[PDB]
């Protein structure tokens, strides 16, 4: 019965979880870790990744 | 200044090496030209300059 208010909660939680899990994507970069990008690369190429 | 040929490539933004780190560092936001010509008839001597 409470599906209307629970689906709201589920949609919000999925939205937040997807937002946070987007922090593990390369998006075409060498890594999703800024520290790794800034330690394994020079400043110029780091400014591209 | 005067630099050996192999280090001329180090006179550019985002370069690394002995020259670009200890002698002459160009900023990452460099706006200007870099001109270099092989002056082997003025800065090279038989006994060693």
Swiss-Prot record, chain B:
Query: Which residue stretches belong to region Integrin-binding motif?
Result: 4-6
Biological role stated in the UniProt entry: Attaches the virion to the cell membrane by interacting with host receptor, initiating the infection. The major receptor is host ACE2. When S2/S2' has been cleaved, binding to the receptor triggers direct fusion at the cell membrane. When S2/S2' has not been cleaved, binding to the receptor results in internalization of the virus by endocytosis using host TFRC and GRM2 and leading to fusion of the virion membrane with the host endosomal membrane. Alternatively, may use NRP1/NRP2 and integrin as entry receptors.
Under the subunit heading, UniProt states: Binds to host ACE2. RBD also interacts with the N-linked glycan on 'Asn-90' of ACE2. Cleavage of S generates a polybasic C-terminal sequence on S1 that binds to host Neuropilin-1 (NRP1) and Neuropilin-2 (NRP2) receptors. Interacts with host integrin alpha-5/beta-1 (ITGA5:ITGB1) and with ACE2 in complex with integrin alpha-5/beta-1 (ITGA5:ITGB1). May interact via cytoplasmic c-terminus with M protein. May interact (via N-terminus) with host bilirubin and biliverdin, thereby preventing antibody binding to the SARS-CoV-2 spike NTD via an allosteric mechanism.
Q: What name does UniProt use for this protein?
A: Spike protein S1
Q: Which gene encodes it?
A: S
């Amino acid at each position: 019965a409470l599906g209307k208010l629970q689906d709201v909660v589920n949609q919000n939680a999925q939205a937040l979880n997807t937002l946070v899990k987007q922090l593990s994507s390369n998006f075409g970069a060498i890594s999703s870790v800024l520290n790794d990008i800034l330690s394994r690369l020079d400043p110029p190429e780091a400014e591209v990744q | 200044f005067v630099i050996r040929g192999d280090e001329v490539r180090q006179i550019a933004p985002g370069q690394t090496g002995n020259i670009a780190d200890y002698n002459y560092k160009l900023p990452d936001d460099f706006t200007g030209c870099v001109i270099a010509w092989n002056s082997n008839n003025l800065d090279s001597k038989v006994g060693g300059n």
